[PDB]
From a paper:
Tweety homologs (TTYHs) are conserved transmembrane proteins present in all eukaryotes including three members (TTYH1, TTYH2, and TTYH3) in humans. TTYHs have been reported to form Ca2+- and cell volume-regulated anion channels structurally distinct from any characterized protein family with potential roles in cell adhesion, migration, and developmental signaling. Each protomer consists of five transmembrane helices (TM1–5) and an extracellular domain (ED) which extends 75 Å from the membrane surface between an extracellular N-terminus and intracellular C-terminus. We conclude TTYHs are not pore forming subunits of anion channels and their function may involve Ca2+-dependent changes in quaternary structure, interactions with hydrophobic molecules near the extracellular membrane surface, and/or association with additional protein partners.
Author numbering:
A (entry chain B): 39 to 71, 89 to 414
B (entry chain A): 5 to 73, 89 to 414
The structure:
C-alpha cells in the first residue's frame, strides 16, 4: 500500500547509503594498498556515547510512561465492568430471590401484590438499563496486548542499545590501550571490528529513522487512527466522548445513568413504604426488607462511584499523558539516537581513513 | 333458611279462576297498566255488582210478597251489624299497619340507597379535586429533584384508575326517586282508604243506633224515613266487597311472583345482576361488586404506600412538602374509612331485610286485612238486608 512506501523507501535508502560507504571505504583501502587526532576521536566518541545514553534513557522513560498510562486506563476499564457485573448479578439474583420470598410470605393479603409487581418491573427496567452500558472486555484485552508487547519490545531494544554502547566503549578503550602500547599489531588489526561496528551504526540509524517517521505519522492524527482501529469496533459515541473530553460535549451515558438512578429511587420509595406499612403485617418480612434496603444502598453507592468513573476527565488525562509521552518523548529520543548513530558513523569513517595513515 | 314463602291463604285466593270482562280465560301475568289485566280485575267488580243487584231484587221481591200476599229481628240485625263492624275495624287496622310497615321499609331502603350514593359521590369528588390539587402543589414543591416525577406519575395513574373504578358503581338517583314517589303514593292512598272506611263504620253504627231509637219510639216517621240511608249503606257495603275482592286478587297475583315482577320493573335502568343479588341472597352469591371493591381498595393501598415512602424519603428535602403530604394521608385515611363503610353498605343483608319486611307487610298483612274487610262487607250487607226486611213487618 501507500503507507508502507515511506518506511520501505527510507530503509532501502539507508541500506544503499551503507553500501555506498562500504564501497568507498574498500576503494580507499585498495588505493592505499597522532596524539591530537587520538584525543579528538576520544572526545567525539565520548560525546556520542553521552548523547546516545541520554536519548536511550529518555526513550526508556517515555515508553514506560506509556505503559503506566496504558495500565492506568486498563484498570478503569476493568473496574467499570466489574461494577456493572456486580450490579447486574445483584439485581438478577439477590433482589429477585428476596422479592419472591417476600411474595411467598405475604401472598395471604393481595393488596401489596400490585406494588410488588411494580417493583419487579422497575428491577427489570434497572437490569435492561444496566445491560445497555458497553462491555469493555474487547478493549481491556487490547490494552493488555499493547502493555505486554510494547514492554517486551522496549526491554529488548534497551538491552540491544546497551550492548551497542558497551561495544563502542570497549573498542574505544582498546584503541586507547593500543595507542599507549605502541600500536600492537594484533590490537591495531581490528579493521574488521571497525567495519562491523560501522555497519551496525548504519543499521541503527536506519531503524531509528524508520521508527521516528512511523511514530511521527501515527502522531500526526492520533485520534483518527485510534477511531479507525478500535473506535470502529465499539460504538463511536463513547470513543468520541473519551477522546475529546470537553465541557460543551454532552455525556453519552447521562440518559441511561439518570434513568437507572430514578429507578433506584423509585424502588427505594416502594421499599420504604412497604417497611412502614408492614408493621401490621408479619414482622418476619422486615428481616428481608432490611436486606432489600441493604441492596438498594449498595446499588446507589456503586452507581455514584460508576458515574464518577464514566466521567471523561480521568480517561482523557490518562490518554493525553500516554500521547504526550509516546509522541513527544519517543520522537526526541529517536532523534537523539539518530544523531548518535550519525556521530558514530562519522567517527568510524574518520578512524578508518586515518587508520593506515597512523600505522 | 329465611326467605319468602307464600302462605296458604294467598295461594288459595290466587287459586280462584281469573276471568276477563267477556268470560274468557286470562293469564295470571301481573301487569298493573295492561288492558287485559285491568279488565280481569274489573270483572270482579262487575260480578259484585251483579250480586248486589240479585240481592236487591230478591229483597224487593220478599218485601212485596210480605206486604201484598217484633223486636227480635231488630236485635239480631243490630248485633250482627255490630259484630260486622268489629271485624271490619280489626281488618282495617291490620291492613293499615301493613301499609305503614311497607312505607317504613321503603323509607329505610331509600335512606340506605341515598347513603350509598352520597358516599360514592364524596369519594369521587375527593379523588377528582382534592388529591389532584394536593399533588399539583407537591409536584411544584419538589420539582427540584427529578426522581420523584416517576412515583408522582404512577400514583396519578392510580388516581385515574380509582376514579374510573368508582364511576363504575351504579347511580341510585332513579331508584331513590322511584321509591320516594311510591312511598308518597302509598301513604296518601292508605290514609284516604283508612279514613273512608272509618267513615263507613261510623255511618253504619249511626244507622244502627237510629234503628234502635226508631224502634224504641214506636216507629217515629222521622226515624222511619231511614230506609233510604239503609239502602245507600247496603249498596256501599256491596261496593266495598267489590273493592276488597279486587284488591285482594291483585295483591295475591303480585305476591305469587314478587321477585320476578320486581326484576321486570327495573330490568333496564340498572343492571339485572345487582337487582337479582339484592332480591335473592340467603347464604352466598357471586357479589358482583366484590372484584371492583377489591381492586379499588388495592389501589388505595398503593396510594398510601407511595405516600408513606415519599414521606420517609422526602425529609432530606425541606419539610415544606409535609404540609401537603400529611393532608394527602388524611385524604387516604378518609377514603379508606369511607370505602369500609361503603362495602358494609353494599352487603345484601340490609337491603334484602328491607325488601322482605316490605313483602311481609304486604303479603302476610294486607291480604288478611282485605279478606276481613270483605267479610265485613258481606256481613254488613246481610245484616242490613235483614233489617230492611224487618222494616215494614214491624208496622
Ligand atoms: C489489565 O486488565 C486485565 C483485565 O481487564 C487484567 O487481567 C486480569 O487481572 C486480574 C488480576 O491481575 C486477574 O484476576 C486473577 O488473576 C490471577 C492470575 O494472576 C488468577 O489466578 C485469578 O484466578 C484471578 O483470575 C484476571 O484473571 C485477569 N483477567 C481478566 C479477564 O480479568 C490485567 O491484570 C490488567 N493489567 C495488565 C498489565 O494486563
Ligand atoms: C329518599 O332519598 C332521597 C335521596 O337522598 C332523599 O333526598 C331527596 O331526594 C329527592 C330526589 O328525587 C329530592 O327531590 C328533588 O328535590 C329537588 C329540590 O331539591 C327538586 O328540584 C327535584 O325536582 C326533586 O323533587 C328531595 O328534595 C330530597 N329530599 C331532601 C330532604 O333533600 C329523600 O329525603 C328520601 N326520602 C325520605 C322520605 O327521607
Amino acid at each position: 500500500e501507500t503507507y508502507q512506501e515511506s518506511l520501505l523507501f527510507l530503509g532501502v535508502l539507508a541500506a544503499i547509503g551503507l553500501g555506498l560507504n562500504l564501497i568507498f571505504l574498500t576503494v580507499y583501502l585498495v588505493c592505499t594498498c597522532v596524539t591530537w587526532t587520538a584525543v579528538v576521536a576520544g572526545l567525539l566518541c565520548c560525546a556520542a556515547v553521552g548523547v546516545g545514553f541520554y536519548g536511550n534513557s529518555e526513550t526508556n522513560d517515555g515508553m514506560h510512561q506509556l505503559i503506566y498510562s496504558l495500565d492506568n486506563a486498563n484498570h478503569t476499564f476493568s473496574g467499570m465492568d466489574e461494577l456493572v457485573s456486580a450490579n447486574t448479578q445483584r439485581m438478577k439474583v439477590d433482589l429477585e430471590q428476596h422479592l419472591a420470598r417476600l411474595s411467598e410470605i405475604i401472598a395471604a393479603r393481595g393488596d401489596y401484590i400490585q406494588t410488588l409487581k411494580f417493583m419487579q418491573q422497575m428491577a427489570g427496567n434497572v437490569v435492561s438499563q444496566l445491560s445497555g452500558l458497553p462491555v469493555w472486555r474487547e478493549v481491556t484485552t487490547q490494552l493488555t496486548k499493547l502493555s505486554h508487547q510494547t514492554a517486551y519490545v522496549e526491554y529488548y531494544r534497551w538491552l540491544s542499545y546497551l550492548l551497542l554502547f558497551i561495544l563502542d566503549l570497549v573498542i574505544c578503550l582498546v584503541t586507547c590501550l593500543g595507542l599507549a602500547r605502541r600500536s600492537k599489531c594484533l590490537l591495531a588489526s581490528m579493521l574488521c571490528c571497525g567495519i562491523l561496528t560501522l555497519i551496525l551504526s548504519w543499521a541503527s540509524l536506519a531503524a531509528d529513522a524508520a521508527a521516528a517517521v512511523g511514530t511521527s505519522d501515527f502522531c500526526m492524527a492520533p485520534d483518527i487512527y485510534i477511531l479507525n482501529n478500535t473506535g470502529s469496533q465499539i460504538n463511536s459515541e463513547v470513543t468520541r466522548y473519551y477522546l475529546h473530553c470537553s465541557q460543551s460535549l454532552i455525556s453519552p451515558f447521562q440518559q441511561s445513568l439518570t434513568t437507572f438512578q430514578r429507578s433506584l429511587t423509585t424502588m427505594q420509595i416502594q421499599v420504604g413504604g412497604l417497611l412502614q406499612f408492614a408493621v401490621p403485617l408479619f414482622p418476619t418480612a422486615e428481616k428481608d426488607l432490611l436486606g432489600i434496603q441493604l441492596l438498594l444502598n449498595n446499588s446507589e453507592i456503586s452507581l455514584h462511584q460508576l458515574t464518577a468513573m464514566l466521567d471523561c476527565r480521568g480517561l482523557h488525562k490518562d490518554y493525553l499523558d500516554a500521547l504526550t509521552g509516546i509522541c513527544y518523548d519517543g520522537i526526541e529520543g529517536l532523534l537523539f539516537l539518530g544523531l548518535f548513530s550519525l556521530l558514530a558513523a562519522l567517527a568510524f569513517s574518520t578512524l578508518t581513513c586515518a587508520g593506515p595513515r597512523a600505522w
